[PDB]
C-alpha cells in the first residue's frame, strides 16, 4: 500500500505524468506558419500592453 | 521464418573445477590463479591486517588522554590541599565580562 | 551589464596592455599550465583513438605539437587572467580609498561585552 | 553548387556578422543583418529538396519580419532623439520593439516555433552553422544595449525558453529537433543573465558553441539523424559512441564536466542580486534536458541495440574525410572545469 | 560584442554620420545644431549613468 | 634477459612513485604556510643555539 | 594528503597499461597498499583536525570513512572478477577505471575544506555509479534504476547549490573552519526556514529518508556486486557526513525543524523492519535493512547530542561493513543458482558449512549482538533518544525486536531445512569467496577490540 | 495589466471581501482571456461559435477560480482576525483547486489542484511578507 | 618510534591552521568589500567600472555654418 503504490504515486509517478503531458502539449504542432504567426501577433500586442505600457 | 532476430544461444556456465581440481576461483589460468591467491592472502591478511592492527594499537597518544588525566590529578591535589572547591560553576572570570548596565 | 568594457584608457584589441608587464609572469611549472598540457595530451590521445591508430604510440610529433600549442595558449591566457584580477583589485582599493564615508571603521567590541543569546540543546 | 560560390556565400555570411559586430551606426548594423540573411538563405538550400525549400522560406519570413521590427525601432529612436549611435535607446517603446525583434532573431520563446522546423529541414552542416554562428550578432547587439533592457520582458522570455526547450525535447526521436530544443534552452540560459552580467553571457555562449560543435561533428562522423540510426554506431565505431555519451553528460550539466561551469556561474551571479527563485526554477527545468540527453545515452552507448547483416561490409572501410578540430572540441567540452577562473580574461 | 576596429585603426567607417553636428556638406547646419553641440559637450567623458542625470 | 621482465613488470613502480611524489608535494605545500612559524602565543619559544627553524 | 590522492591517479594508467592477464592482481595489490598507507590517518588530535593545506583537511569523523573506502576498493575488485571473466580486456579495464574514479572522487569528497568543492565532488560521484549500474547490471530494470538513482539525487541537491552560493554572498566564505568559527544563530523567518530545507533535503535524500527512499531498492538490486557494495557501504554515508558538517549553521532552527524528519525516521524504521519480514527477494531484504539503519542514523544526527553523534559514526562504519558482507553472501548464492528468490535454494548448510558459518556471523552482527560496534552505535543512539524523550524507547524497542526476527528468518530460510532436490550445480566454495568474507568480518571484531577509532570527534 | 494587480493589492487583507473577490475574478477573467487567445491561435476551433464556446469556458473557469480564491481567502482572514497569515492563502488556493476540479469533473484533478494551488498561494504570501523578488532589479 | 618516524609535533599543525585561518578570513573580507564596491559603483557611476560609452565631443564641426545662428 505505501512503498509500491502511494509513495511511488506522489513523487516520481506524478512528476513523470506531468512532464509527459506538458511535453505532449508543447511539442504537438502542425507546422503551419499561419498559426504561430498569429501567435506572434498576439505576443507582440501582449508585450506592448503588459510590459511596455508599464515603465 | 517465425523468428524475430538472429541470436547466439545462451551459453552454459563454465565450471572452474573441471579443468583445475584445485582452482581457487581466481582465474582459469592455473599459474595466474595461484599467484592471485598468494598475493591476495599476503597483502590482505599478512600485511594490511596484522601490521595495520599493530600500528593502530600502538598509535601515540595524540588525543591527550593521559595528559588530561595527569593535569586533573595535579588540579585536584592543589584544590584539595588549599581547601578550594573542586570545580567552579563559572568557567570565565566575571571581571573580564561587562554585562548590560540596565536590566529594566 | 559590463564592468570593464569602458574603463578609461582601455585599448580596444590589445589583449595585453603595457601595464600588465609590471606583474610577475606565471612560472613555467604553474599547475594550471601543467593542466593545459594534460589537456593537449588528452586531445592527442583522442585524435589517435578517432583515427583508429594505436592510441599511445601512433604519432609522437602530433602529440608533441598538441601539448606545445596548448601550453603556448595557456601561458598568455594565464597572464591575461592575472592582469584582469590585478586590475579589479587595484580599482576596488582605489575606490575604497577615495570614498571613506561609505566604508567607515567602527569600534571593535570584545566578546566579553557582547550579549549573545544562548539556545540550549535538549 | 560551385565550391567558389559556396565559399563566397560563407564569406558574405561572416562579413555580415562582423559588420554588425564592428559597426557604431544603427544603419550599418541593419545592413549587416540584411547581408547575413541574404547570404545565409542559399546555404540552407545547398541540398535541394522540398524540406530544404520549406525551411528556407520559413527562415526568410521570420528574419524579414525581425528586420522590419528592428528598423522600425531604430527609426522611432531616431525620431525621439536625433542619434544614430548604438547606446541606451532613449525611447522605451523602441527598446521593447528592439527586444522583441532580437528575440525573434535568436529563437527565444515564444518566438521559437521556427527553430526545430528549420533545423530538421536542413542538413547537419547547415544546422551546425545555424545553431552556432547565427547567434553571434543578436547577442552582441543585446550585450551592447544591455543597460536599457527591461528585466521583466527578457527574464520572462528566458524562463519560457528554458521551459519550452525542455518540454519539447522530451518528445523528440529526431536528433536535429533534439538539438534545436537544446539550443532553445541554452539561449534562454544565456539571456537570463544578460541584464546582470554580459561576461557570463559570453562565457555561456562560448561553452555552448564548443559543445554544439563537438556534438554536430560527432553526428556528422556517424551519419545518423535519428535515434535508431545512431543506435547502430556501437557496432561500427565504439569510441565515437563513448565520446558521444561523455559529451551528452557534459551538456546535461553534470559535474565535474565543463557543461556545469556556465550555469553554476550564472546562478552565482543571479544570487549576487536577490533573485533566488529564478535560478532554482532554471535548474529544476534543466533537469528535463538532462533527462532526454540521458535517454539518448541509453539508446546509443550504455546498451547494445540489434544490428544488421550488411554492417559487416562497413567494417572493411575507413572514414575518408576527417574533422581536424574534433578532438580539441571534445576536450574543451569535457575537461575544462578546473580552468574556470580564466573567464576573467573575457571581460 | 563590440570590437572597436575603427577606434583601434583610426578608420572612421561610419562615425561621420552618427550625429547631426558632424561636418555637414557645404556647412549646412542642422535645425538643432547648437543644442546637440551643448549636450555632447556636457555629456563627454563622464559615462552614461552620470550623463543621464 | 631482463628486457622482457622490465617490459612486463615496469607498471609496478607507478604507485610507489606517485606516493613519493605526493609526499614531496605535501612538503612543498607545507613550505607555503609558514607565516606563523614560532609566532603563536601558545608555542612561542626562544631558538636553540644551533637550529634555524622550529619546524619545516 | 596528496600522498593518498596521487597513488590512485597512478592506479589509473597502471591498470590501463597492464597486461591482459595481470589487471586484477596489480589492481588488488596496489589498492591494498593504498589502504595500508591511508591507515596512517587514524592518528587524530583531540582539539582540532589535521589541516594539511588550504584545500584539504582530515577530521576524526572523515578518517574512518577514508579508511573504509580504501579498504572496500580491493574487496570490490575481488568480488567483480568472477562475473567479469567473459568480458573483453578493454571493458574490464573500463570497469576498473570506473571503480578507481569513484574511489578518487570519494577520497577528495570526504576531505574538502570548502562546501562548494565538497558539493562538486559529492555530485561527481554520481557519474561512475550511474555508468556502472546502467552498463554492467544484469536485468532490464537497471536502466530504470539508474534514472531513479540520478534524478532523486539531483532534485534534492540542485537547490542546495543555490543555498551554498547565497551563503557565500552573505557570510563571505564557505570554508568549514571559518564557517564554524563565525557561526551565528538563524532567526525565525520563512526565508531561514527555506534555507534550512535547501541545506538539509539533499543529504536527507542521500541517506535515504523514509518516503524519499524509493530509489534505493532499485539501485541496490539492479546494480552489479561491486556497485551494490560501494552503494551500501560508502555512498549512503555521504549524506550523514554532509548533514553533520552542515548542521553547524542551522541552529537554533533545527530545534523545531527536526520534528517531521524525526517522526518520519522512527516510523519508517519500524515500517522497513516490518517490510523485511515479507520479502521474496534476498537483495531487497538487505536494502531495506540499510534503510532502517540509516533511519537510525538520521534520528541520531537530528537530535544533535555528542552521544548521538558518536553512535551515528559507529553505526555508519559498522553498517557499511555488515551490508557489504551480506551483499557478497547473497551474490555467492546468486552466482551458483542464477536466481535471487530466497526460498529457491534451501538447506545450504548441509552442502556449504563454512559459508553457513559466514552467514551466521553476518546475521548475528546485523542484529547487533554485543559487544560488536553495531550494538555500540545502536545503544548510544538509543540512550541519546531516551534522553531526548523517554517514550522513544518504545519504538526503538520494537525495532530492536523486529530486526532480530527478520535477520534470523533470512538465515533459517537459506541455511536450514532440507536441500532442494533438483538443484545439483552447487559447487564447493572457492578460496576467493571465503577470503572475501573473512576480509569483511575480521576488521569488524578488530574494531570491536578498539572502539575509540570510530566514535568520531565528539569522543 | 498591473492596474488590476494594484486594485487587488490596495485593499487590506481581511477587509471588504466583496471588492477583493471582484478584483480576483477580474484578474482570473484576464488570465483566461489570454489563455483562450493563445489556444485559439495555436489550436483553431474549426467554427466561430466553437471558438466562442471555448473562450467562454476557459474565461468562466478562470474567473470562478479567482472569485472563489479571493472570497474564501478574505473570509478566512477576517474570521480568524489573523492577517498576514499564509494559511489563509493556502485555504484560498485549495478552494480554487476544488473549484477547478468541479469544473473539470475530476477528483484527482481537484486534489492535485488543491494541494499545488494552496502551496503556491502560501508561497506568494510568504514572498509578500519577506519581500522576495521574482524579477530582481540589477544591483551589483 | 612511530611518533619519531611518521609524525611531527603539534605546533606545526597549530601554526599551519593559524595561517590557513588568516588567509581565509582575509579572502572573505575582501569578497564582501568587493561586493559593496560593485554595488556603489553601479549605483553612482562615478568609478572606473560600469562606464557606458557617450558620444565623442571631437566629432563636432566648429566651423561657420552658412548661417550666423548655427
Ligand atoms: C580527476 C583526476 C584526473 C582524471 C582525468 C580525467 C580522466 C582521464 C583523462 C581522460 C582522457 C584520456 C584518454 C582519452 C583517449 C582514449 C580513447 C580510448 O578509447 O582508449 C582506448 C585505449 C586502448 O586502445 P588500444 O591500446 O589502441 O587497444 C585497444 C583497442 O583500441 C580496442 O579499442 P575498442 O574501440 O575496440 O574498445 C571499445 C571501447 C572503447 O571505448 C573507450 O575506450 C571509452 C573511452 C572514452 C574516453 C573518455 C572520454 C573523453 C575524456 C573525458 C573523461 C571525463 C572524466 C570525468 C569523470 C566522468 C567519467 C566519464 O568501447 C566500449 O567498450 C564500450 C564501453 C562503454 C562504457 C561507457 C563509459 C566510457 C566513458 C568513461 C571515461 C572515463 C575517463 C577515461 C578513462 C580512460 C579511457 C582510456 O586506451 C588507452 O590505452 C589509453 C589510456 C592510457 C594512456 C595514457 C597513459 C600515460 C602514460 C603512462 C605513464 C604515466 C606517467 C605518470 C607520470 C609519473 C612518471 C612515472
Ligand atoms: C570467550 C571465547 C574465548 C575464545 C578465545 C579465542 C578467540 C579467537 C577469536 C578469533 C575470531 C573468531 C573466529 C572468526 C571466524 C570464525 C572462525 C572459523 O572459521 O571457524 C572454523 C574452524 C574450523 O571448524 P570447522 O570444522 O570447519 O567447522 C565447520 C563449520 O563452520 C561449523 O563451525 P562452528 O559451528 O563451530 O562455528 C564456529 C563458531 C565460532 O565462530 C564465530 O561465530 C566467530 C564469531 C563469533 C560471533 C561474533 C559476532 C557477534 C559479536 C561478537 C564480538 C566479539 C568480538 C571479540 C573480539 C574479537 C577480536 C578478534 O560458531 C559459534 O560457536 C557461535 C558463536 C557464538 C558466540 C556467543 C558469544 C558472543 C560473544 C560473547 C562475549 C564475547 C567477549 C567475551 C569477553 C567479555 C568480557 C568477559 O573452527 C574455529 O576456527 C574455532 C571456532 C571457535 C569458536 C569461538 C566462538 C566464540 C568467539 C567469540 C569472540 C572471541 C573473542 C576472542 C578475543 C578475546 C575475547
Ligand atoms: C506597432 C506594433 C503593433 C501592430 C499590431 C496592431 C495593428 C492593428 C492594425 C489592424 C488593421 C486591420 C488590418 C487587417 C489585417 C488582415 C487580417 C487578415 O488577413 O485575416 C486573415 C485571417 C485568415 O483569413 P482566411 O484564411 O481567408 O479566413 C479563414 C476563416 O475566416 C476562418 O476559418 P475557420 O472556420 O476554419 O476557423 C474558425 C474560426 C473561429 O474563429 C474564432 O475562434 C474566434 C472567436 C473568438 C471569440 C472572441 C471572444 C468574445 C468576447 C471577448 C472580448 C474581450 C473583451 C471583453 C472582456 C470580457 C467581456 C465580458 O476562425 C479561426 O479560428 C481563425 C483565427 C482567427 C480568430 C481571430 C484572430 C485574433 C487573435 C485570436 C483571438 C482569439 C479570441 C480569444 C479572446 C481574445 C480577445 C478577444 O482572417 C481571420 O482570421 C478573421 C478576420 C480578422 C480580421 C478582422 C479583425 C482585425 C484584427 C486586427 C488586430 C486587432
Ligand atoms: C510518508 C509516509 C507515507 C505517506 C504517503 C501515503 C499516504 C498519503 C498519500 C496517499 C493518500 C492521499 C490520496 C487522497 C485521494 C486522492 C484522490 C484521487 O486519487 O482521485 C483519483 C480517483 C479517481 O476519481 P475519478 O476518476 O475522477 O472518479 C471515479 C471515482 O472512483 C468515483 O467516486 P465515487 O462515486 O465512488 O465517490 C467519491 C465520493 C464519495 O466517496 C465514496 O464513494 C465513499 C465515501 C468515502 C469518502 C471519505 C470521507 C468520509 C469519511 C472520512 C472521515 C474522517 C477522515 C479521517 C480523519 C479523521 C479525523 C480524526 O468522494 C467525494 O465525494 C469527495 C468529497 C469530499 C469529502 C471527503 C474529503 C475529505 C478530505 C480529508 C480532510 C482531512 C483534513 C485534515 C485532518 C487532520 C486531522 C487528522 O479518485 C477516487 O476514486 C477517490 C475519490 C475520493 C477521494 C477523497 C478521499 C479523501 C482521502 C484523504 C485525503 C487526505 C490526504 C491528502 C492531504 C493533503 C490534501 C491537501
Ligand atoms: C580460526 C580460529 C579462530 C579461534 C582461535 C583464535 C586464536 C586466538 C586469537 C584471538 C585473540 C583474542 C583477542 C584478545 C584481546 C588481545 C588484544 C588487545 O590486547 O589489543 C588491543 C588493541 O587492539 C587494536 O587496537 C585493535 C585493532 C585495530 C583495528 C584496525 C583493523 C586493520 C585495518 C583494516 C582496514 C579497516 C577497515 C574498516 C575501516 C574503519 C588492546 O587495545 P589498547 O587498550 O589500546 O592497548 C593498550 C596497550 N597499548 C596501548 C600500549 C598498545
Ligand atoms: C515523502 C516525505 C517527503 C519529505 C517531507 C519533508 C518535510 C518538510 C515539512 C516542513 C516542516 C515545517 C515547515 C514550516 C514550519 C512550521 C509549519 C507550520 O505548521 O507551523 C505553523 C505555521 O502556521 C501555518 O501552518 C501557516 C503555514 C501554512 C502554509 C504551509 C502549507 C501546509 C500544508 C501542507 C503541505 C505539505 C508540504 C509538503 C509537500 C510535499 C506555525 O505558525 P507561525 O508562528 O505563524 O509560523 C512560524 C514562522 N514565523 C515565525 C516566521 C511566523
Ligand atoms: C516546472 C518544471 C519542473 C521540472 C521537474 C524536473 C523533473 C526531472 C525528471 C524528469 C522525468 C520525466 C519523465 C518523462 O517525461 O516521461 C516519463 C517516462 C516515459 O518513459 P520514456 O523513457 O520517456 O519512454 C521510453 C519508451 N517509449 O516514464 C518513465 O518511465 C520515467 C522513469 C524515470 C523517471 C524517474 C523520475 C524520478 C523523480 C523523483 C522526484 C524528482 C522530481 C523533480 C522535482 C522535485 C520536487 C521539487
Ligand atoms: C526528490 C525529493 C527531494 C525534494 C528536494 C526539494 C526541497 C527543497 C526545499 C526548498 C528549496 C528552495 C530554497 C532556495 C534556496 C534558499 C536560499 C535562501 O535563503 O534564500 C532566501 C529566499 O527564500 C526563498 O526565496 C525560497 C522560495 C522557494 C521557491 C521555490 C519553492 C520550491 C517548492 C517549495 C515547497 C517544497 C519544500 C519542501 C519539499 C520537501 C520534499 C518533498 C532568502 O532570500 P532573501 O530574499 O534575500 O531574504 C531576505 C530578503 N527578503
PDB file of N, CA and C in Angstrom, chain D residues 206-250:
ATOM      1  N   UNK D 206      30.247  30.763 -25.359  1.00  0.00           N
ATOM      2  CA  UNK D 206      31.431  30.032 -25.806  1.00  0.00           C
ATOM      3  C   UNK D 206      31.335  28.551 -25.455  1.00  0.00           C
ATOM      4  N   UNK D 207      30.916  28.240 -24.225  1.00  0.00           N
ATOM      5  CA  UNK D 207      30.782  26.840 -23.827  1.00  0.00           C
ATOM      6  C   UNK D 207      29.736  26.132 -24.681  1.00  0.00           C
ATOM      7  N   UNK D 208      28.592  26.783 -24.907  1.00  0.00           N
ATOM      8  CA  UNK D 208      27.543  26.184 -25.720  1.00  0.00           C
ATOM      9  C   UNK D 208      28.018  25.958 -27.144  1.00  0.00           C
ATOM     10  N   UNK D 209      28.752  26.919 -27.705  1.00  0.00           N
ATOM     11  CA  UNK D 209      29.240  26.776 -29.070  1.00  0.00           C
ATOM     12  C   UNK D 209      30.192  25.596 -29.170  1.00  0.00           C
ATOM     13  N   UNK D 210      31.094  25.453 -28.198  1.00  0.00           N
ATOM     14  CA  UNK D 210      32.019  24.322 -28.226  1.00  0.00           C
ATOM     15  C   UNK D 210      31.275  22.994 -28.121  1.00  0.00           C
ATOM     16  N   UNK D 211      30.321  22.901 -27.188  1.00  0.00           N
ATOM     17  CA  UNK D 211      29.580  21.653 -27.017  1.00  0.00           C
ATOM     18  C   UNK D 211      28.777  21.313 -28.265  1.00  0.00           C
ATOM     19  N   UNK D 212      28.122  22.313 -28.859  1.00  0.00           N
ATOM     20  CA  UNK D 212      27.326  22.088 -30.059  1.00  0.00           C
ATOM     21  C   UNK D 212      28.198  21.693 -31.240  1.00  0.00           C
ATOM     22  N   UNK D 213      29.359  22.333 -31.392  1.00  0.00           N
ATOM     23  CA  UNK D 213      30.264  21.965 -32.474  1.00  0.00           C
ATOM     24  C   UNK D 213      30.736  20.529 -32.323  1.00  0.00           C
ATOM     25  N   UNK D 214      31.122  20.137 -31.106  1.00  0.00           N
ATOM     26  CA  UNK D 214      31.553  18.762 -30.877  1.00  0.00           C
ATOM     27  C   UNK D 214      30.433  17.777 -31.181  1.00  0.00           C
ATOM     28  N   UNK D 215      29.223  18.075 -30.709  1.00  0.00           N
ATOM     29  CA  UNK D 215      28.105  17.160 -30.900  1.00  0.00           C
ATOM     30  C   UNK D 215      27.754  17.014 -32.377  1.00  0.00           C
ATOM     31  N   UNK D 216      27.682  18.134 -33.097  1.00  0.00           N
ATOM     32  CA  UNK D 216      27.331  18.084 -34.511  1.00  0.00           C
ATOM     33  C   UNK D 216      28.422  17.410 -35.329  1.00  0.00           C
ATOM     34  N   UNK D 217      29.692  17.643 -34.986  1.00  0.00           N
ATOM     35  CA  UNK D 217      30.773  16.967 -35.693  1.00  0.00           C
ATOM     36  C   UNK D 217      30.730  15.463 -35.459  1.00  0.00           C
ATOM     37  N   UNK D 218      30.436  15.038 -34.227  1.00  0.00           N
ATOM     38  CA  UNK D 218      30.285  13.611 -33.956  1.00  0.00           C
ATOM     39  C   UNK D 218      29.110  13.022 -34.727  1.00  0.00           C
ATOM     40  N   UNK D 219      28.002  13.762 -34.819  1.00  0.00           N
ATOM     41  CA  UNK D 219      26.841  13.270 -35.559  1.00  0.00           C
ATOM     42  C   UNK D 219      27.116  13.212 -37.057  1.00  0.00           C
ATOM     43  N   UNK D 220      27.962  14.107 -37.561  1.00  0.00           N
ATOM     44  CA  UNK D 220      28.371  14.036 -38.960  1.00  0.00           C
ATOM     45  C   UNK D 220      29.288  12.842 -39.185  1.00  0.00           C
ATOM     46  N   UNK D 221      30.173  12.566 -38.223  1.00  0.00           N
ATOM     47  CA  UNK D 221      31.099  11.443 -38.346  1.00  0.00           C
ATOM     48  C   UNK D 221      30.351  10.120 -38.470  1.00  0.00           C
ATOM     49  N   UNK D 222      29.370   9.896 -37.609  1.00  0.00           N
ATOM     50  CA  UNK D 222      28.498   8.727 -37.682  1.00  0.00           C
ATOM     51  C   UNK D 222      27.188   9.200 -38.299  1.00  0.00           C
ATOM     52  N   UNK D 223      26.994   8.903 -39.582  1.00  0.00           N
ATOM     53  CA  UNK D 223      25.971   9.585 -40.364  1.00  0.00           C
ATOM     54  C   UNK D 223      24.577   9.185 -39.905  1.00  0.00           C
ATOM     55  N   UNK D 224      24.170   9.685 -38.742  1.00  0.00           N
ATOM     56  CA  UNK D 224      22.907   9.323 -38.120  1.00  0.00           C
ATOM     57  C   UNK D 224      22.115  10.580 -37.799  1.00  0.00           C
ATOM     58  N   UNK D 225      20.863  10.618 -38.254  1.00  0.00           N
ATOM     59  CA  UNK D 225      19.960  11.719 -37.963  1.00  0.00           C
ATOM     60  C   UNK D 225      18.800  11.322 -37.066  1.00  0.00           C
ATOM     61  N   UNK D 226      18.565  10.030 -36.862  1.00  0.00           N
ATOM     62  CA  UNK D 226      17.520   9.538 -35.983  1.00  0.00           C
ATOM     63  C   UNK D 226      18.147   8.737 -34.849  1.00  0.00           C
ATOM     64  N   UNK D 227      17.332   8.451 -33.833  1.00  0.00           N
ATOM     65  CA  UNK D 227      17.818   7.697 -32.683  1.00  0.00           C
ATOM     66  C   UNK D 227      18.213   6.278 -33.076  1.00  0.00           C
ATOM     67  N   UNK D 228      17.393   5.625 -33.900  1.00  0.00           N
ATOM     68  CA  UNK D 228      17.665   4.241 -34.272  1.00  0.00           C
ATOM     69  C   UNK D 228      18.927   4.130 -35.117  1.00  0.00           C
ATOM     70  N   UNK D 229      19.124   5.053 -36.058  1.00  0.00           N
ATOM     71  CA  UNK D 229      20.334   5.020 -36.872  1.00  0.00           C
ATOM     72  C   UNK D 229      21.577   5.312 -36.043  1.00  0.00           C
ATOM     73  N   UNK D 230      21.438   6.087 -34.967  1.00  0.00           N
ATOM     74  CA  UNK D 230      22.546   6.279 -34.040  1.00  0.00           C
ATOM     75  C   UNK D 230      22.782   5.051 -33.175  1.00  0.00           C
ATOM     76  N   UNK D 231      21.746   4.249 -32.936  1.00  0.00           N
ATOM     77  CA  UNK D 231      21.891   3.048 -32.123  1.00  0.00           C
ATOM     78  C   UNK D 231      22.746   1.975 -32.784  1.00  0.00           C
ATOM     79  N   UNK D 232      23.061   2.110 -34.072  1.00  0.00           N
ATOM     80  CA  UNK D 232      23.892   1.146 -34.780  1.00  0.00           C
ATOM     81  C   UNK D 232      25.381   1.447 -34.683  1.00  0.00           C
ATOM     82  N   UNK D 233      25.757   2.599 -34.131  1.00  0.00           N
ATOM     83  CA  UNK D 233      27.146   3.040 -34.195  1.00  0.00           C
ATOM     84  C   UNK D 233      28.056   2.214 -33.295  1.00  0.00           C
ATOM     85  N   UNK D 234      27.514   1.618 -32.231  1.00  0.00           N
ATOM     86  CA  UNK D 234      28.347   0.832 -31.325  1.00  0.00           C
ATOM     87  C   UNK D 234      28.975  -0.362 -32.029  1.00  0.00           C
ATOM     88  N   UNK D 235      28.344  -0.856 -33.090  1.00  0.00           N
ATOM     89  CA  UNK D 235      28.870  -1.986 -33.838  1.00  0.00           C
ATOM     90  C   UNK D 235      29.835  -1.570 -34.937  1.00  0.00           C
ATOM     91  N   UNK D 236      30.040  -0.273 -35.144  1.00  0.00           N
ATOM     92  CA  UNK D 236      30.949   0.221 -36.169  1.00  0.00           C
ATOM     93  C   UNK D 236      32.149   0.947 -35.580  1.00  0.00           C
ATOM     94  N   UNK D 237      31.925   1.957 -34.738  1.00  0.00           N
ATOM     95  CA  UNK D 237      32.999   2.657 -34.032  1.00  0.00           C
ATOM     96  C   UNK D 237      32.572   2.914 -32.594  1.00  0.00           C
ATOM     97  N   UNK D 238      32.933   2.021 -31.666  1.00  0.00           N
ATOM     98  CA  UNK D 238      32.521   2.215 -30.265  1.00  0.00           C
ATOM     99  C   UNK D 238      33.085   3.474 -29.628  1.00  0.00           C
ATOM    100  N   UNK D 239      34.277   3.909 -30.043  1.00  0.00           N
ATOM    101  CA  UNK D 239      34.901   5.083 -29.443  1.00  0.00           C
ATOM    102  C   UNK D 239      34.051   6.323 -29.687  1.00  0.00           C
ATOM    103  N   UNK D 240      33.474   6.434 -30.885  1.00  0.00           N
ATOM    104  CA  UNK D 240      32.620   7.573 -31.196  1.00  0.00           C
ATOM    105  C   UNK D 240      31.425   7.611 -30.255  1.00  0.00           C
ATOM    106  N   UNK D 241      30.818   6.453 -29.990  1.00  0.00           N
ATOM    107  CA  UNK D 241      29.671   6.413 -29.089  1.00  0.00           C
ATOM    108  C   UNK D 241      30.067   6.743 -27.656  1.00  0.00           C
ATOM    109  N   UNK D 242      31.233   6.275 -27.209  1.00  0.00           N
ATOM    110  CA  UNK D 242      31.684   6.607 -25.859  1.00  0.00           C
ATOM    111  C   UNK D 242      31.909   8.110 -25.703  1.00  0.00           C
ATOM    112  N   UNK D 243      32.600   8.720 -26.669  1.00  0.00           N
ATOM    113  CA  UNK D 243      32.820  10.161 -26.621  1.00  0.00           C
ATOM    114  C   UNK D 243      31.501  10.916 -26.712  1.00  0.00           C
ATOM    115  N   UNK D 244      30.559  10.395 -27.501  1.00  0.00           N
ATOM    116  CA  UNK D 244      29.226  10.979 -27.579  1.00  0.00           C
ATOM    117  C   UNK D 244      28.533  10.957 -26.227  1.00  0.00           C
ATOM    118  N   UNK D 245      28.641   9.843 -25.502  1.00  0.00           N
ATOM    119  CA  UNK D 245      27.972   9.751 -24.208  1.00  0.00           C
ATOM    120  C   UNK D 245      28.585  10.720 -23.208  1.00  0.00           C
ATOM    121  N   UNK D 246      29.915  10.831 -23.201  1.00  0.00           N
ATOM    122  CA  UNK D 246      30.549  11.769 -22.276  1.00  0.00           C
ATOM    123  C   UNK D 246      30.168  13.206 -22.624  1.00  0.00           C
ATOM    124  N   UNK D 247      30.127  13.535 -23.918  1.00  0.00           N
ATOM    125  CA  UNK D 247      29.723  14.878 -24.323  1.00  0.00           C
ATOM    126  C   UNK D 247      28.274  15.161 -23.942  1.00  0.00           C
ATOM    127  N   UNK D 248      27.388  14.176 -24.111  1.00  0.00           N
ATOM    128  CA  UNK D 248      25.997  14.352 -23.706  1.00  0.00           C
ATOM    129  C   UNK D 248      25.891  14.599 -22.210  1.00  0.00           C
ATOM    130  N   UNK D 249      26.671  13.862 -21.417  1.00  0.00           N
ATOM    131  CA  UNK D 249      26.694  14.107 -19.979  1.00  0.00           C
ATOM    132  C   UNK D 249      27.166  15.522 -19.676  1.00  0.00           C
ATOM    133  N   UNK D 250      28.147  16.013 -20.439  1.00  0.00           N
ATOM    134  CA  UNK D 250      28.610  17.385 -20.250  1.00  0.00           C
ATOM    135  C   UNK D 250      27.504  18.393 -20.538  1.00  0.00           C
TER     136      UNK D 250
END
